[PDB]
Write a protein that binds this ligand. Structure first.
Ligand SMILES: [Mn+2]
Length: 256
DNA sequence: GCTAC
DNA sequence: CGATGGGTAGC
DNA sequence: CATCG
């Protein structure tokens, strides 16, 4: 069984302090896609690049302790693409790709426009320029999985308070429509939603109030799988037994 | 303190 | 609905 | 952005 995990670790150093490293092996996952390294190549320890002997490939931001995605895999990838190819977004390290046969896996950290309206604009541009990339990847004819923090909840069932969050970044009508086009127009499969049509499956909880405690969260972490491979999905779950971040690991198992 | 999620 | 208060990571 | 008026 091919177990792929997606985890926005909100700082890989804090995550490791919280035992995320031990979880990498404990989960017996074959591939682990992390977002928000919040560190640079010099800040990363060997266990943060190649945990448990796994191969590791990372894309760090030009800013310190900010963003950053990475991909670990027990198997040696025959190819690795760092960055999307757009310096504007590559400056922040949000895209990594690794090829394993006809299988490609991407660690993706989509910009959050919650901090400021300007960051919301940067997010929208990231959507416009990234959509074509998802289209090309869909047309490659390969089995592709895009794990990561998409920072967009698609429908009401993807968050607790969908009513009061229709004007907030992450659940804007334009954003929901974008994810919707990725799924139905492009042909990508929201693995979780497909496997569990009625299970909300929150992957993130705000630090404000008692969000995590009351389970008032969003499902903004996705594994967008291509049709062929998407049909091979057997099960999935949101590991909550331990908390290493404000996000939660998204585990999906494929008969592949 | 700062930044940024 | 609109108005009100925010914990964390790492610089 | 959850929680309050
Ligand atoms: Mn975060």
């Amino acid at each position: 069984m091919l177990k792929i995990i997606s985890a926005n670790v909100n700082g890989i150093r804090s995550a490791y302090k919280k035992g995320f490293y031990e979880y990498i092996a404990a989960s017996g996952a074959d591939i682990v896609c992390v977002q928000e390294l919040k560190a640079q190549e010099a800040d990363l320890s060997a266990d943060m690049k190649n945990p448990h002997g796994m191969h590791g490939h990372w894309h760090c931001a030009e800013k310190r302790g900010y963003s950053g995605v990475a991909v670990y895999s027990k198997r040696k990838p025959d190819n690795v693409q760092i960055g999307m190819g757009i310096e504007e977004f590559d400056r922040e390290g949000r895209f990594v790709r690794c090829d394993f046969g006809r299988l490609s896996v991407i660690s993706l950290y989509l910009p959050s426009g919650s901090s400021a309206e300007e960051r919301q604009q940067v997010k929208y541009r990231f959507l416009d320029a990234f959509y074509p990339m998802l289209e090309a990847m869909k047309n490659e004819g390969r089995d592709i999985v895009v794990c990561g923090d998409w920072n967009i909840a698609h429908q009401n069932i993807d968050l607790k308070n969908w009513k009061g969050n229709q004007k907030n970044s992450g659940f804007l009508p334009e954003e929901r429509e974008w994810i919707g086009k990725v799924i139905h127009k492009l042909g990508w499969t929201d693995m979780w939603r497909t496997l569990y049509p009625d299970v909300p499956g929150y992957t993130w909880w705000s630090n404000r109030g008692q969000a995590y405690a009351k389970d008032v969260g969003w499902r903004i972490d996705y594994q967008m799988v291509t049709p062929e491979l998407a049909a091979k999905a057997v099960s999935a779950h949101v590991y909550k037994d331990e908390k290493f971040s404000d996000h939660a690991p998204l585990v999906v198992e494929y008969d592949y």
